[PDB]
Design a protein around this ligand. Structure first.
Ligand SMILES: O=c1ccn([C@@H]2O[C@H](COP(=O)(O)OP(=O)(O)OP(=O)(O)O)[C@@H](O)[C@H]2O)c(=O)[nH]1
Ligand SMILES: O=c1ccn([C@@H]2O[C@H](COP(=O)(O)OP(=O)(O)OP(=O)(O)O)[C@@H](O)[C@H]2O)c(=O)[nH]1
Ligand SMILES: [Mg+2]
Ligand SMILES: [Mg+2]
Ligand SMILES: [Mg+2]
Ligand SMILES: [Mg+2]
Lengths: 272, 272
């Protein structure tokens, strides 16, 4: 009985691909229009049934915690001016059945180290990992799509998307074999292959459902990719081509396209 | 001998027109592409000859201070990975002839109270005021244009822009008389007039050069507009229609247009 109720948000990194905006502000707090990247990722997890949110964070990232906590002085200001609609955007941003906890990563030693850092809070359960700089706009939350596959197949699941072959140098690419239309069994993961040498055009994105067996593989490993490759030998790992549109907001170019696209879709904002 | 060397940046406000992005992050830190609003405003002041930067700030706004201070852990990370170009975006963001100081505003009691809060650091000098949510893209820094007028005429100067008459309800509008092509003498300021009743279509923007005489008028006043109206009786106040394009980034709509426009101009980013 596979139950995924915990989601890990690695948010301890330095955000260097987005300077100077991120000199003194977490990349995860940068807004797509009027909402931080981390809020979209959290809402997706909650919408997929996650109840326990685990942030692996750092000294200079208090804004992330403060964003999901009460802000009493602001809530007092809004009540005082009678702006009760705004009060609802701020108060109880998370529903009452969800809880958050935070863990300091010693140093920014990698995504793999960040995942390993969450092990005491996760225990032996399977768990989700979401990278907030991958903003996904989907009719059905992408993490829900991935969890459903992981439960049905009793294995780990990597969210993948089709990319142009000429761009494979930018991603981790799975070598995999189809099992059904959207789901493939992973046999290898290759970091940043040449286009002509890429085994598939399926790039790993920042959405994972992982069995707790991953933790031991990361202690011998610092790269989550290498941990996953080790796991492949013991346990089943699948890739799932999810339905949705990803924007890579780790850099200004994808952030900009997300701003334009969700600007139009959700806000009625159109380039003048 | 009129010398404007000090600029005041009111940055203590709650940013409520941009929630939830600003729940736990200052509005002034929100980026236009890859740079915070406050950095554009500061760069404009420095480019106009300002040497003394005065921030009127609040408890939850440490990111602003941290942005203009050294970030040693980040500078160590960038040197360690040999990324010396990025090191230049972060280290000495301000030239060596400029200095910053910070003053806590007791509570967010208004722009007029914020200006008055800076009085001990300003002394009897004329001084600039810039509101970072007014992002101005100009060939010649707008504050320089305003200072030049203030020195030449030995009076205070309000930056104004022509707005559509149907939008006058959104702004403070000067009643004024032309003295030369871009410069007018102010006789009244009317807050948010009906279009058919607006005295002109010249709206005050977030750029001021003010004589120290303003401070006494704000102690009897909490609205900078009312302080300026009092000053008009004693001293000369001019409005200057500056050359430049303003974006009102206090809200998502103008921020979005700034993102599109400066995205294209400075970053090569074009809506897909
Ligand atoms: O040591 C680390 C490294 C990375 N991460 C987290 O892994 C995710 C994916 O890592 P990214 O490479 O997308 O983000 P980054 O902040 O490390 O970016 P750069 O400086 O390299 O430009 C991000 O959400 C990051 O916060 C950690 O939590 N800890
Ligand atoms: O008490 C105050 C009020 C305003 N200000 C500063 O005055 C400038 C113009 O004030 P704005 O109205 O543009 O900003 P705000 O943050 O007050 O916004 P809302 O909550 O009303 O949406 C902003 O730069 C603000 O920081 C202060 O410094 N202190
Ligand atoms: Mg990284
Ligand atoms: Mg990334
Ligand atoms: Mg205000
Ligand atoms: Mg404003």
């Amino acid at each position: 009985h596979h139950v995924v109720r915990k989601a890990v948000f690695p948010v301890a990194g330095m955000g260097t691909r987005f300077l100077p905006a991120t000199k003194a502000m977490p990349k995860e707090m940068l807004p797509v229009v009027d909402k931080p990247l981390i809020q979209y990722a959290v809402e997706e997890a909650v919408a997929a049934g996650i109840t326990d949110l685990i942030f692996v964070t750092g000294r200079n990232k208090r804004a992330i915690e403060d964003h999901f906590d009460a802000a009493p002085e602001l809530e007092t200001d809004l009540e005082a001016k009678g702006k009760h609609e705004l009060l609802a955007l701020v108060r109880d941003i998370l529903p009452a059945h969800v809880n958050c906890l935070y863990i300091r990563q010693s140093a920014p030693l990698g995504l793999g180290h960040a995942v390993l850092t969450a092990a005491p809070a996760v225990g032996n359960e399977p768990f989700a990992v979401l990278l907030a700089d991958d903003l996904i706009d989907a009719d059905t939350p992408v993490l829900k799509q991935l969890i459903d596959v992981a439960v049905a197949r009793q294995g780990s699941v990597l969210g993948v998307q089709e990319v142009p072959r000429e761009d494979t140098r930018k991603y981790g690419i799975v070598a995999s074999q189809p099992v059904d239309a959207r789901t493939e069994r992973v046999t290898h993961i290759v970091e940043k292959p040449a286009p002509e040498q890429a085994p598939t055009t399926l790039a790993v994105v920042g959405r994972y459902v992982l069995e707790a067996a991953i933790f031991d593989h990361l202690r011998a490993t610092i790269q989550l990719t290498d941990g996953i490759a080790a796991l492949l030998r013991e346990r089943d790992v699948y890739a799932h081509r999810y339905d949705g549109k990803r924007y890579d907001c780790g850099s200004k170019a994808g952030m900009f396209q997300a701003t334009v696209a969700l600007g139009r879709k959700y806000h009625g904002l159109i380039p003048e």
